[PDB]
Structures are given as C-alpha cells and as structure tokens.
Amino acid sequence: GGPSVFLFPPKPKDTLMISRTPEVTCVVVDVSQEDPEVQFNWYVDGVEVHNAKTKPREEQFNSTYRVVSVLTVLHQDWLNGKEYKCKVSNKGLPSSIEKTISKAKGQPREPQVYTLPPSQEEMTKNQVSLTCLVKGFYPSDIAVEWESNGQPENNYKTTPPVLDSDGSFFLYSRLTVDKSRWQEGNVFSCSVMHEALHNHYTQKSLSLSL
Amino acid sequence: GGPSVFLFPPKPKDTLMISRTPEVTCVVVDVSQEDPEVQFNWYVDGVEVHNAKTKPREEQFNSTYRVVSVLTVLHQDWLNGKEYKCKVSNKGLPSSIEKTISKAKGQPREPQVYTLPPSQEEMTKNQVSLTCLVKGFYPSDIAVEWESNGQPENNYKTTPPVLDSDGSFFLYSRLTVDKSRWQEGNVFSCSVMHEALHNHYTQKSLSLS
Ligand SMILES: *[C@@H]1O[C@H](CO[C@@H]2O[C@@H](C)[C@@H](O)[C@@H](O)[C@@H]2O)[C@@H](O[C@@H]2O[C@H](CO)[C@@H](O[C@@H]3O[C@H](CO[C@H]4O[C@H](CO)[C@@H](O)[C@H](O)[C@@H]4O[C@@H]4O[C@H](CO)[C@@H](O)[C@H](O)[C@H]4NC(C)=O)[C@@H](O)[C@H](O[C@H]4O[C@H](CO)[C@@H](O)[C@H](O)[C@@H]4O[C@@H]4O[C@H](CO)[C@@H](O)[C@H](O)[C@H]4NC(C)=O)[C@@H]3O)[C@H](O)[C@H]2NC(C)=O)[C@H](O)[C@H]1NC(C)=O
Numbered sequence A: 001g002g003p004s005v006f007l008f009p010p011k012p013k014d015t016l017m018i019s020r021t022p023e024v025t026c027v028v029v030d031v032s033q034e035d036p037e038v039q040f041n042w043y044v045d046g047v048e049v050h051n052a053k054t055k056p057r058e059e060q061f062n063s064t065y066r067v068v069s070v071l072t073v074l075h076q077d078w079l080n081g082k083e084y085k086c087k088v089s090n091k092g093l094p095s096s097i098e099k100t101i102s103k104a105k106g107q108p109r110e111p112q113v114y115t116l117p118p119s120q121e122e123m124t125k126n127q128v129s130l131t132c133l134v135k136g137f138y139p140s141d142i143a144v145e146w147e148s149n150g151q152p153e154n155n156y157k158t159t160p161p162v163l164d165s166d167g168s169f170f171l172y173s174r175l176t177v178d179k180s181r182w183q184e185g186n187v188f189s190c191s192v193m194h195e196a197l198h199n200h201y202t203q204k205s206l207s208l209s210l
Numbered sequence B: 001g002g003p004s005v006f007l008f009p010p011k012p013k014d015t016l017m018i019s020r021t022p023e024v025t026c027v028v029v030d031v032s033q034e035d036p037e038v039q040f041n042w043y044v045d046g047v048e049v050h051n052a053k054t055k056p057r058e059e060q061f062n063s064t065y066r067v068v069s070v071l072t073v074l075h076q077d078w079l080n081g082k083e084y085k086c087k088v089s090n091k092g093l094p095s096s097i098e099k100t101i102s103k104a105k106g107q108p109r110e111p112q113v114y115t116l117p118p119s120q121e122e123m124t125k126n127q128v129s130l131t132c133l134v135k136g137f138y139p140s141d142i143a144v145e146w147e148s149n150g151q152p153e154n155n156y157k158t159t160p161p162v163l164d165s166d167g168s169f170f171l172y173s174r175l176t177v178d179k180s181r182w183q184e185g186n187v188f189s190c191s192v193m194h195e196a197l198h199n200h201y202t203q204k205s206l207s208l209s
C-alpha cells in the first residue's frame, strides 16, 4: 500500500497580516520503520524553494510513522494564487508522491457583517447569545473573533462557512455572555478578517439598546 | 484497489415520527464489471436480520458500479442505541467489509430555539435575513424547517450542527425573505424536530414588532 500525503493550507488569519507566519504543511503518514529517510522537495509555481523545516519522524500508536514538513509562504504569494507543491520521496529510491495546493479561484467578494442582539425569549436565561452574521463572502477562507473592552472574549463558537445559492458563503458566530454584562450596557464587537475587506479587517459592535 | 462501503443513518425526521419509515442504508461503490454478485448481511446488536431490500447494481459515469441495500429499522431500537452492522461480500469469494453505525451515546438534551429578526443595518437591502438559533441539543440528529401562514418557506439554508464547549451542539438556520413581506407583518415560523423535545417538535414564530 505505502504512505499517503496530505497538504494543508495556511490558517486564514495568518495570510492576512504580514506580521503573522502563514505556512503550508505537508504531512506523510503510514511510513514504515524500515523506509529510508523521507525527503521533501517544495516548489512555488514550479520553482524549487529551500526554506522548509522538516521535523524528525514520529511514531504513531498504530505502529506507523508520521513525518511533517512546513513551508513558510509569502502572504502576497498565497493571496495572489501561487501554487505550492510538495514532492515526497525516500532517500536512495526513485519514486515519489506529489500534492499541490493554492487559494480557491474566483472573484473575491467582501463579507457583509451584521450583529444581532439576544432574542427577547432568551432574556429570561442566566446567559444570552450575541450573534454575528457574516455573509456574501468569497473565498470561504475567513476568521472571526469577539472582544469587549479591548480584550478577547473566550466563550464563542463559529459555524463553518456554508455555501449560498449565489455562490458566496455565509456563517454565524455565537458569543455567550452573562446577562448581567449585557444588561449593564457593555459593548461587544465581532471582528472579521477576510482578503476582500479594506485592510483585511472590519469590526461591528453591539450593546443593549436605548 | 477494491470497492468502498458507506453506511448511513436514518433521516432525523424519520426516527421521530412513528408514521414515517426510518432506514439505515449500506452503499457500495467502485464495484467492477467482472466482480461477482454483491451480497449484504445485516445485524442488529450482532443478531442477523433478513428484511433488507437490495437494489441491482447501477453503472456510474466513471465506469464503475454502485449497489445499495436498505434496512428498515424500528424507531425505538435506533433511539435506544442499538448497533446496526452491514457486512458486504461477493458470492463465492472469502473477504468482506463491515461497517457499523448507531446513535451517538449520552444523555439527550433539549434544543433551545430562538428566532432573531434582521439587523437594522440589513434593512436597507431588498431582501432580509430571518435567523433561527437552535442550541444546547444532544445528540446532533435534528431537522429544522421554516413556514409562514401555514405554508412551507423554501428560501433558507441551515448550518451543520457545531460542537459547543459544554458538549452539546448548536446551529443556525437563515431564511431569506423579501423586505416587503417582512414589513407587511407576515408571521414566519422556524420548526425543529428533535428527540429531546416534547412530542419531538417545537416551533417559534417571528414577526415585525
Ligand atoms: C495511523 O495513525 C495516523 C495518525 O492518526 C493519529 O494516530 C492514530 C493512531 C489515531 O489515534 C488517530 O486518531 C490520530 O489522529 C493516521 O493518520 C491519518 O491518516 C488519515 C488518512 O488515513 C488522514 O486523513 C485525512 O485527514 C485530513 C484532515 O486532516 C486534518 O484534520 C484531522 C482531524 O479531522 C487531524 O487529525 C489532522 O491532523 C489534520 O489536522 C490539520 O493539520 C493541519 C496541518 O498540521 C493544520 O494546519 C490544520 O489546522 C488541522 N486541521 C484540523 C481540523 O485539525 C482530510 O482532509 C483528509 O480527507 C481528504 O482526503 C480523503 C482521502 O483520504 C477524502 O475522503 C476527503 O473527502 C478529503 O478529500 C479532499 O476533499 C477536498 C474537498 O472536496 C478535495 O478538494 C481534495 O482533493 C480531497 N483530497 C483527497 C486526497 O481526496 C483525510 O481524511 C489524517 O490526516 C491522518 N492523521 C494525522 C494526525 O496525520 C493513519 O491513517 C493511521 N494508519 C492506519 C493504517 O490506520
């Protein structure tokens, strides 16, 4: 049978701020004990690059090895659609496995970001939900966070992007907060990062209405 | 390589309504032309059963064959956590492939269902979004629909259930409607079917205040 290779894109937030470190990650599993040292060759639009960092093989609990190579990519290259190819081989043997990845193709579209207060029926509860609807975006690569008083909020979860009838994506993020903090008039903000937003970032706030 | 087998659970509405017919479905793909007859054996907690309906093989566009076998299950069996196993083989050959499925284990939890009107900032657009939040439920098997004035409303999309930090699930469903219908005061309703609701059903209405 032999090994399999999986090649993963950078995290959406990492490609949107040049101070962060976006990486493409090439993972080889089902490596055998006696397989020669696994080797990686990396290409960016077909041109070989040499700055990848490959980790020593690690045994998994199913009596196989896993080997990972990580390539730091230029933010602009990823966003401009360059193709990243990982070629996996074993030292001393001719055969290889290649995988390629790139950003999704298609005209990027800007998310529209709306915040929604708790339902009136939820106000009887000890905690309430603040909702951030993000829709109309493309590609589906996106990051959503919440904060209040300049500090990140902990207690939120965000749905995966869902494909809409017009070919763009939507999602919702739900922040749970104590009703007391909402009742006291604290302002909460949903932050969205996406390549089609001005400076790759927007924020919308909400708080209890007058 | 050889064939691949996928085993699918009953549809969520089907297990919650006794008048409905819940089924488990065993699907085999990548069956070659020259492969001997595909055979199914089915078990319920390890005991063989004999009431499955198997369709003849179907040629696919990619020049392979697909075979499907359908087992009708009892509502209570599924909801009580019984394990359904499909064993796929070929007449006269020794090997097999087995797949098992059952309802997720653990204490069921009632969905809380809340409707949310469109954002004021969205109200400048010609169509607006009506949102149904369903949260705190377990297991994740659930159905969500919308209607208005007694008739189904079709222009909605629902997120997959999302695992929350307390071990339950939540999702949102978004119904898109013309601004005018919302402003005329029509009442829309989100309906939710889940095993941990009374009568396995609840609905919450939404309209312009
Ligand atoms: C022996 O064990 C190893 C290691 O497993 C670990 O140890 C064992 C003992 C157990 O304890 C495990 O529980 C434990 O995790 C096994 O290695 C696994 O091998 C399987 C395949 O056999 C790989 O499956 C793939 O998984 C990827 C997604 O992988 C991410 O998500 C996993 C959780 O869901 C997570 O575990 C992974 O590590 C990985 O996590 C990501 O990592 C990156 C990089 O580090 C990181 O940046 C991300 O943030 C992180 N993400 C998350 C969510 O955590 C999945 O994508 C693959 O599915 C594709 O391919 C399938 C074909 O195999 C296909 O059916 C799918 O549909 C999908 O197909 C793709 O679909 C797109 C969309 O249409 C299409 O465009 C593509 O073309 C298409 N691609 C292909 C190829 O078809 C796949 O399911 C595991 O990743 C791997 N685990 C690890 C940790 O490496 C090994 O199998 C065991 N061996 C035996 C013999 O049992």
Ligand SMILES: *[C@@H]1O[C@H](CO[C@@H]2O[C@@H](C)[C@@H](O)[C@@H](O)[C@@H]2O)[C@@H](O[C@@H]2O[C@H](CO)[C@@H](O[C@@H]3O[C@H](CO[C@H]4O[C@H](CO)[C@@H](O)[C@H](O)[C@@H]4O[C@@H]4O[C@H](CO)[C@@H](O)[C@H](O)[C@H]4NC(C)=O)[C@@H](O)[C@H](O[C@H]4O[C@H](CO)[C@@H](O)[C@H](O)[C@@H]4O[C@@H]4O[C@H](CO)[C@@H](O)[C@H](O)[C@H]4NC(C)=O)[C@@H]3O)[C@H](O)[C@H]2NC(C)=O)[C@H](O)[C@H]1NC(C)=O
Binding pocket: B004, B006, B008, B009, B011, B025, B027, B029, B030, B060, B061, B062, B064, B066
């Ligand atoms: C030749 O063609 C056939 C036919 O395909 C059709 O024709 C071609 C030409 C294309 O146009 C296709 O688009 C077209 O559909 C090909 O057959 C396909 O083969 C692939 C495998 O390569 C199968 O993929 C699996 O899909 C299931 C989900 O399948 C449902 O949803 C599909 C839409 O995505 C839909 O097409 C299917 O019909 C099926 O629909 C369900 O049907 C049942 C009853 O029929 C119904 O009750 C459901 O409501 C309905 N659902 C929907 C949404 O409509 C997917 O789940 C599989 O992923 C699992 O396994 C992967 C590999 O093993 C693994 O990597 C994944 O991570 C995942 O793993 C599972 O994860 C869950 C939780 O995450 C866990 O609980 C499980 O334990 C775990 N399982 C395992 C084993 O790990 C998988 O991706 C297609 O279904 C199949 N299509 C059909 C119609 O049967 C064939 O591949 C072609 N051959 C070649 C050589 O190309």
